[PDB]
Amino acid sequence: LSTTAAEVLEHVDAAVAAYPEVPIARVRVEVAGIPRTLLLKLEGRSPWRSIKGRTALGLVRSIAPRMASRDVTVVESTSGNLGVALSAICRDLGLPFVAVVDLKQSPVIQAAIEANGARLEVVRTPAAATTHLLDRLDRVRKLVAEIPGAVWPNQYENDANRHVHETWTAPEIDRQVGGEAQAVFVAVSTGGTLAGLAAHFRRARPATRLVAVDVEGSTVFGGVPGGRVLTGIGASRRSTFLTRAECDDLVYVREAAAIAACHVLRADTGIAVGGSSGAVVAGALDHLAAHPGLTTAVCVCADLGENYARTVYDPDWLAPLRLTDDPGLLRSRLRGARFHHA
């Protein structure tokens, strides 16, 4: 171990011992005449305000031994959340960090990345092309060549991503509500979270249904990429970590139901979840309607609504999509679903 590498490892292990337990909010909603409990795993209640704080620590740990000195620049592609966490860890460690982003990124998340002193490399792909991710990966490789010291953790293929969720995220959930949860709903982009959770649950709770939630136009599990307004959830490439056989079901959600879920849940309970979380809640509403015997499920909520305050919760961003922020109208997009505290 070099000097820089020993320290990084130690910082990462301190962050992990000091990482809080992520809470669960218990919510009830009647679906097709049958009451259901949603266990919302609120991963935005966390130091870097998303689940990707765990991902980021997993990844930094894996790239530490590659660090000779403090010359190293950390480069990574992100839709947002991983940026914030890697950005913060690198600020805390004194290591420079370049975040490769595109124009679709949530402004709130982009601002939290800049505030951590990262360098933003914006990619100029026009919003409503389908090559954003490939263009980001493209630009990352240009930067790894053009910058000495440069180190790419590769969230997309680095097994540390799935591994952290298998060994940390999934046991915590299991320990909290494993005896109760008949299903777990998980949004996909890289697929590392679900691949990790699935690896844990298929061993420890085989009877628990694992359900991927994705959005229209995402090709995590195959298909033809299409344009999307939501971020975090969805990718224009197949997952390295996960195939369709590794989970029990897969539901795609229209983005307007995801948006509707965000607003209605907030109105009904005061829990404001992030965009992918709304898609997960919408997806669980659909899935439970088709499964009368499923009455308790975890929704893994990747982040919270404060990250989307100038998109998903902004009346002006919604107007070009023909949507209000009126909970009553948006409830019609969820078949009248009503949430309450359990």
Contacts to ligand P1T by CB under 6 A: 50, 52, 78-82, 187-193, 232-233, 274, 276, 302-303
The C-alpha atoms of residue 218 and residue 223 are separated, in whole angstroms, by 8
318 token code pair: 């919604």
The residue to which tokens 């990345």 are assigned:
113
305 token code pair: 């609504």
Helix (H) or strand (E) holding 332: none
The least CB distance from residue 99 to ligand P1T, in Å, is 9
The C-alpha atoms of residue 238 and residue 253 are separated, in whole angstroms, by 18
The least CB distance from residue 188 to ligand P1T, in Å, is 4
* Residue 153 or 191 having the CB closest to ligand P1T: 191
- Residue 47: how many CB atoms within 10 A of its CB? 16
The C-alpha atoms of residue 181 and residue 191 are separated, in whole angstroms, by 21
* Residue 7 or 121 having the CB closest to ligand P1T: 121
* Residue 152 or 331 having the CB closest to ligand P1T: 152
The least CB distance from residue 247 to ligand P1T, in Å, is 12
* Residue 166 or 303 having the CB closest to ligand P1T: 303
The least CB distance from residue 61 to ligand P1T, in Å, is 16
- With contact defined as beta carbons under 8 Å apart, do 167 and 55 qualify? no
Which residues are within 8 A (CB) of 142 and not within 5 positions of it... i.e. 6 or more apart? none
261: closest CA among 299, 228, 291, 235?
Answer: 299
295 token code pair: 């009455």
The least CB distance from residue 193 to ligand P1T, in Å, is 3
* Residue 207 or 245 having the CB closest to ligand P1T: 245
List, in sequence order, every residue forming a beta bridge with 253; answer none if it has no partner.
Answer: 215
The least CB distance from residue 30 to ligand P1T, in Å, is 27
38 token code pair: 């949603």
* Residue 84 or 331 having the CB closest to ligand P1T: 84
The least CB distance from residue 236 to ligand P1T, in Å, is 11
280: closest CA among 164, 185, 208, 156?
Answer: 185
Which residue is closest to ligand P1T by CB?
232
The least CB distance from residue 187 to ligand P1T, in Å, is 4
* Residue 96 or 274 having the CB closest to ligand P1T: 274
Burial (CB count within 10 angstroms: exposed 0-12, middle 13-18, buried 19+), residue 236: buried
* Residue 46 or 81 having the CB closest to ligand P1T: 81
